[PDB]
């Protein structure tokens, strides 16, 4: 690893993801290979989120990836803000197809015709379906592994309800699960808020989101989305149910949709990584503890003690690997598993082995702890938990010191250009948000809105005006440069 | 269910997969929706197979779905066979791309360029990667859900080895796992064999496969394949490693690939499905036991009735018997009886007021329909024994139908006659591609194709035996018959 994070973040990020064996590059621009080390992190996210939504009654399924040309021309609002982001398949080999079919940028147009057929009575509600699949979102920006990719893995849940009350409560419930994925699994603090009318999901009623901050570049990034679609989609696809008491009365269902992608892994890398490579939170680390024989007569004695620790950690269900390979130097193994971000390195040397003790090296801080043999299960469990909270507390210390309030325009400008995100009084108008992005690049890149936070840092002053100095302010809005 | 299995099988198949809430149709032909009832079966197959390949050192990953045209044409024999069924992306919205890119029909040409970068030394081998993903093969033949789809889910494992012995060993290991999936999980007997030169994976060395038989249609179907690719792909993508003992020497890696698709669910539906609907083998049954309260006057005693269903729901979970208590008060019990019958739940547990007073209940088997009156005492043990008896009964019934419609034929006179009986035949075959085309041509005057060259044939081919054509010597018994 040659590049430094605080200097050239782009070169550092490329070396960290590749030398840790997370990502390989593909011949198709914007497409990246998810190697096992990174795929296991997605599986840890998948295992947590799947078990949580099944408590809410959500069931897993799989819908086709192709969208017909007629189905996309259904909702006029959903097709406009998505057509340039859709790749079309027009031929099979040397034979043109009947009609050009589209690769899914999202599965609203695929599932909701089926929802209309499944929903006829009030007993058929609520429908709660989820799928883990890939999605092709063609775009024109600069692709980045995990962060901005033309193909990415995600889950997308789509729920239909008989009332808007229950639909509104699922939006926040799923958004809170997304917050737990970032805060409790990846040790990343997020800000929960609402998207502005300019950046909300097209055709939906409102979009909620979680925003994470990357202090290495001073830019924020959207971590997830939970949309309330209202009856907009159910009216165009005719998702209607019969009234359970009023004979013959039919009502359009209230729908939601929510997604979480593999950019979680990229935000984990950007926030926690250092100049020695990746840093994995123990909650999602494929290997939490790596056992390395040091000082490698009684050679079989040292190897069997490594196997004793390996099985003792498996009994308390700690993900452990014993690198017993004789082809590489111990110092080589030290650097190999540090680049890969293993939270704890367990070193067993001949002297320590005969003393019934070992050395545990913390990946986050580099601290070396000498631990006795009998305390291996309890101590290593305590260090792993201490690593998880340390990563979260240090990440939140960056968020608290890089998100502040500004009530005028150029103080919002002055704080922004120092690598921060700012909450400002905003009128919420779309034409005003265009001027903000143009002025932020005028007086780099132009700052766009991130979210209208639920719990802002400060409450709005009575009668406070927007930063544009032309319309009254509706709410504090978190602005800043974004990926 | 409208149609019946013995009559219009295609109509029966559509009814059973939709009324069981497995498949919903899409407005694009060949593409189908995997509803949660069908997806749970795929998840059960995934959990078994994934754990088995982890023991062999295989690791999960995910490669991109797009293929460049330069990488696709790196192996000429491989691209020549998949070319007509490759879906090509040619436009981004309303703008035509300068160079079109392809949707993967398979991931050999996607992964092996990455294998070349990862393999430099002998320590880099073996590589054993697997991915659970979707794939697109645009077959213009009349599609059918699960059996013949344009897009389907599968797993594909790709392994590279330093030697041929270990590579050849993995081929038979993965093949036996595919056999376990059909026989142990889905209760479907299969025949292990090698595909002919005409039907093997183009570009590979040899293809092993498992062939199942559908007695309702008399046709056989390929249930999965495990290919030995040899060095044909490593030579084209330059997957080379330095010799561990000879300085400067490099050798090409020996590669394998193996895939199992959602066709498994279709075969399970075709083999075990009856006129009452789907029939799930208890090994992959999302719900093995469904509790339905039946007998609805006294609201005070009905309160203890739902408590009895929850009582059975709780203690059945102690032995981890997947049990669901259908306690919905917005549907008739008779509606729930036929609803869970269509879905194929192996056992229906009916709770009645009189049965509660007599300290008894009634268990209904899905495969046989035998309504058996059991007691509260042996509720956990006998429902466990009935589940295992259902799995064996389904497998025995499908094995007897296979052992009945798979016979040996030493003459085209016998081969075409027993082919009209809705059967499959093992005949002495020379293995020539031109002869396999002649066999397919003369059996339509509905043409029969080659299925597999069985490892354990019905009879042994002794020297002096000629092929069914008569122009060349026969080298092995080959299972023929009409296929999907
Ligand atoms: O694309 C989106 O943002 C929503 C959420 C997942 C499904 N559609
Ligand atoms: O398509 C096939 O049949 C082989 C096996 C899985 C990957 N490629
Ligand atoms: Sr549900
Ligand atoms: Sr009305
Ligand atoms: Sr109404
Ligand atoms: Sr491995
Ligand atoms: Sr040589
Ligand atoms: Sr050589
Ligand atoms: Zn304004
Ligand atoms: Zn012949």
Between strands A250-252 and A240-242, the pairing is antiparallel
C-alpha span between B304 and B162 (Å, rounded) = 67
3-state secondary structure A129-191: EEEEEEEECCCCCCCECCCECCEEEEEEEEEEECCHHHHHHHHHHHHHHHHHHHHHHCCCCCE
Q: Which two tokens stand for residue B411?
A: 């003459």
CB A215 within 8 A of CB A136: no
Ligand 2 in contact with B106 (CB < 6 A)?
yes
Between strands A151-161 and A254-261, the pairing is antiparallel
C-alpha span between B129 and B56 (Å, rounded) = 11
The CA B193 to ligand 9 mean position distance, Å, reads 72
Hey, how many other C-beta atoms are within 10 angstroms of the C-beta on A101?
Answer: 23
- A225 marked ligand binding residue: yes
The secondary structure of A356-397 as a DSSP string is: TEEEEEETTT--EEEEESTTHHHHHHHHHHHHHHHHHHHHHH
How far does B100 lie from chain A, in Å, by closest CA?
A: 10
Hey, how many other C-beta atoms are within 10 angstroms of the C-beta on B92?
Answer: 18
Q: Which residue has the tokens 């082919």?
A: B419
> Is there a contact between B89 and A103 if contact means CB atoms under 8 Å apart?
yes
Query: Among B21, B25, B27, which would you mutate to test the A interface (most chain A Cβ atoms within 10 Å of its Cβ)?
Result: B27
How far does B93 lie from chain A, in Å, by closest CA?
A: 4
Using CB atoms within 10 A of its CB, is residue B283 exposed (0-12), middle (13-18) or buried (19+)? buried
- Please tell me the number of the ligand nearest to residue A466's CA: 9
Q: Apex CA A445: angle with CA A443 and CA A450, to 5°?
A: 105
> Is there a contact between A327 and B153 if contact means CB atoms under 8 Å apart?
no
- Any idea what DSSP says for residue A121? S
Which residues from B are below 8 Å from A39, CB to CB?
Answer: 60-62
| Contacts of the segment B327-332: beta carbons below 8 A, 24+ positions apart | B327/B291, B327/B293, B330/A123, B331/A123
Q: Which two tokens stand for residue A129?
A: 């379906």
C-alpha span between A69 and A88 (Å, rounded) = 9
The CA B47 to ligand 2 mean position distance, Å, reads 20
- A442 marked ligand binding residue: no
DSSP H or E run through B482? none
Q: Which two tokens stand for residue B161?
A: 């080895």
Q: Whose CA is nearest to atom 6 of ligand 1?
A: A259
Query: Among B88, B145, B261, which would you mutate to test the A interface (most chain A Cβ atoms within 10 Å of its Cβ)?
Result: B88
C-alpha span between A207 and A229 (Å, rounded) = 8
Q: Which two tokens stand for residue A386?
A: 């201490």
- Any idea what DSSP says for residue A437? H
C-alpha span between B188 and B196 (Å, rounded) = 23
Method used experimentally: X-ray
Q: Which two tokens stand for residue B235?
A: 């030579």
Q: Which residues pair with B24 in a beta bridge?
A: B33
**Which of A60, A100, A327 has the CB atom closest to B39's CB atom?**
A60
CB B223 within 8 A of CB B270: no
In 3D space, the residue among B251, B380, B396 whose CA is nearest the CA of residue B317 turns out to be: B380
**Which of B32, B60, B89 has the CB atom closest to A39's CB atom?**
B60
Q: Which two tokens stand for residue B393?
A: 């009964």
C-alpha span between A368 and A344 (Å, rounded) = 10
How far from each other are the two terminal CA atoms of chain B, in whole angstroms?
24
Starting at the edge strand found earlier in the chain, the sheet holding A368-372 runs A320-322, A289-293, A344-348, A357-362, A368-372
CB B251 within 8 A of CB B147: no
Name A241's Cβ contacts closer than 8 Å, sequence gap at least 6: A119, A120, A121, A122, A124, A125, A162, A250, A251, A253
- A137 marked ligand binding residue: yes
C-alpha span between B482 and B93 (Å, rounded) = 43
- Any idea what DSSP says for residue B458? S
Between strands A320-322 and B23-25, the pairing is unpaired
Q: What number does the ligand 2 atom closest to the CA of B135 have?
A: 1
- Any idea what DSSP says for residue B284? T
Tell how far CA B249 is from the center of its chain: 42
Hey, how many other C-beta atoms are within 10 angstroms of the C-beta on A166?
Answer: 14
C-alpha span between A83 and A67 (Å, rounded) = 12
Pocket test of ligand 2: the residue of B259, B261, B262 to mutate, having most ligand atoms within 8 Å of its CB, is B259
Collapsing DSSP to helix, strand or coil, A433 comes out as: helix
Name A223's Cβ contacts closer than 8 Å, sequence gap at least 6: A178, A182, A188, A190, A209, A210, A211, A212, A260, A263, A264, A267
CA atoms within a 13 Å half-sphere pointing along the CA-CB vector of B46: 17
In 3D space, the residue among A258, A236, A240, A260 whose CA is nearest the CA of residue A248 turns out to be: A240
Q: Apex CA A387: angle with CA A384 and CA A392, to 5°?
A: 135
**Which of A28, A68, A87 has the CB atom closest to B68's CB atom?**
A28
Q: Whose CA is nearest to atom 1 of ligand 1?
A: A106
Hey, how many other C-beta atoms are within 10 angstroms of the C-beta on B375?
Answer: 12
DSSP H or E run through A411? helix A409-416
- Please tell me the number of the ligand nearest to residue A243's CA: 5
Pocket test of ligand 2: the residue of B139, B149, B225, B232 to mutate, having most ligand atoms within 8 Å of its CB, is B225
In 3D space, the residue among A347, A450, A361, A460 whose CA is nearest the CA of residue A399 turns out to be: A450
> Is there a contact between B84 and A103 if contact means CB atoms under 8 Å apart?
no
Ligand 2 in contact with B209 (CB < 6 A)?
no
C-alpha span between A318 and B15 (Å, rounded) = 48
Which residues from A are below 8 Å from B84, CB to CB?
Answer: 92-95
The pocket around ligand 1, CB under 6 angstroms, is made up of A 106, 108, 156, 201, 225, 227, 257-259
Which residues from B are below 8 Å from A31, CB to CB?
Answer: 64, 66
- B222 marked ligand binding residue: yes
C-alpha span between B64 and B138 (Å, rounded) = 19
Which residues from B are below 8 Å from A158, CB to CB?
Answer: none
The CA B61 to ligand 7 mean position distance, Å, reads 33
Entry resolution (Å): 2.2
Using CB atoms within 10 A of its CB, is residue A90 exposed (0-12), middle (13-18) or buried (19+)? middle
Which residues from A are below 8 Å from B134, CB to CB?
Answer: 62, 65, 133-134
Q: Which residue has the tokens 């007691």?
A: B375
- Please tell me the number of the ligand nearest to residue B240's CA: 8
Q: Given its phi and psi angles, is residue B342 left (phi above 0), alpha (psi -120 to 50 degrees) or beta?
A: alpha
* Inter-chain Cβ pairs, chain A and chain B, closer than 8 A: 149
C-alpha span between A213 and A270 (Å, rounded) = 9
Ligand 2 in contact with B258 (CB < 6 A)?
yes
Q: Which residues pair with B481 in a beta bridge?
A: B449
Alpha helices in A30-107 (DSSP H): 36-55, 69-72, 76-80
CB B214 within 8 A of CB B481: no
Q: Which two tokens stand for residue A228?
A: 């309330």
The CA B350 to ligand 1 mean position distance, Å, reads 42
Alpha helices in B20-101 (DSSP H): 36-55, 69-72, 76-82
Q: What number does the ligand 2 atom closest to the CA of B258 have?
A: 5
The secondary structure of B157-201 as a DSSP string is: EEEEESSHHHHHHHHHHHHHHHHHIIIIIS----EEEE--TTTS-
C-alpha span between B419 and B414 (Å, rounded) = 8
C-alpha span between B130 and B126 (Å, rounded) = 13
CB A225 within 8 A of CB A157: no
In 3D space, the residue among B23, B66, B149, B61 whose CA is nearest the CA of residue A135 turns out to be: B66
Name B404's Cβ contacts closer than 8 Å, sequence gap at least 6: B215
> Is there a contact between A85 and B93 if contact means CB atoms under 8 Å apart?
yes
């Amino acid at each position: 690893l040659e590049a430094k994070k605080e200097e050239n973040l782009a070169d550092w990020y490329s070396q960290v993801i590749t030398k840790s064996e997370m990502i390989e590059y593909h011949d198709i621009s914007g497409c990246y290979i998810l190697r096992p080390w990174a795929y296991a992190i997605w599986e840890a996210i998948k295992d947590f989120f799947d078990a949580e939504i099944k408590k809410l009654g959500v069931e897993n399924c799989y819908f086709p990836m192709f969208v017909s040309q007629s189905a996309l021309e259904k909702e006029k609002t959903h097709v406009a803000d998505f057509a340039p982001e859709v790749a079309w398949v027009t031929r099979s080999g040397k034979t043109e197809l009947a009609e050009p079919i589209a690769i899914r940028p999202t599965s609203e147009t695929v599932m909701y015709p089926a929802y209309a057929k499944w929903v006829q009575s009030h007993r058929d509600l609520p429908i709660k379906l989820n799928q883990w699949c890939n999605v092709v979102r063609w775009e024109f920006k600069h692709p980045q592994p995990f962060l901005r990719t033309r193909e990415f893995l995600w889950q997308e849940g789509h729920s239909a309800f008989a009332t808007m009350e229950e639909a509104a409560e699922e939006v926040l419930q799923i958004l809170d699960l997304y917050a737990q994925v970032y805060e409790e699994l990846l040790a990343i603090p997020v800000v929960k808020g609402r998207k502005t009318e300019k950046e909300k999901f097209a055709g939906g009623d409102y979009t909620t989101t979680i925003e994470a901050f990357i202090s290495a570049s001073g830019r924020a990034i959207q971590g997830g989305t939970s949309h309330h679609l209202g009856q907009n989609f159910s009216k165009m696809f005719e998702i209607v149910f019969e009234d359970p008491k009023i004979p013959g009365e039919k009502q359009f269902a209230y729908q939601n949709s929510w997604g979480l992608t593999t950019r979680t892994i990229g935000v984990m890398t950007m926030v926690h990584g250092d100049n020695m490579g990746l840093v994995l939170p123990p909650r999602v680390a494929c290997v939490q503890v790596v056992i390395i024989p040091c000082g490698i007569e009684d050679k079989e004695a040292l190897i069997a003690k490594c196997n004793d620790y390996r099985r003792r950690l498996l009994s308390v269900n700690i993900r452990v690997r014993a690198d017993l390979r004789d082809n590489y130097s111990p110092g080589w193994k030290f650097n190999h598993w540090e680049l890969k971000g293993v939270p704890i390195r367990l070193e067993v040397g001949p002297r320590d082995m005969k003393s019934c003790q070992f050395v545990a090296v913390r990946r986050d801080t580099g601290e070396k702890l000498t631990v006795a043999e009998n305390e291996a299960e309890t101590k290593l469990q305590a260090i792993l938990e201490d690593i998880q909270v340390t990563l979260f507390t240090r990440a939140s210390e960056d968020l608290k010191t890089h998100m502040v309030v500004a009530n005028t325009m150029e103080d919002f400008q002055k704080i922004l250009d120092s690598g921060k995100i700012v909450q400002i009084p905003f009128c919420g108008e779309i034409d005003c948000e265009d001027w903000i992005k143009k002025t932020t690049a005028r007086d780099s890149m132009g700052a766009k809105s991130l979210c209208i936070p639920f719990k802002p840092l400060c409450e709005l002053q009575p009668g406070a005006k927007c930063v544009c100095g032309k319309n009254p302010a509706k709410y504090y809005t978190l602005f800043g440069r974004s990926y």
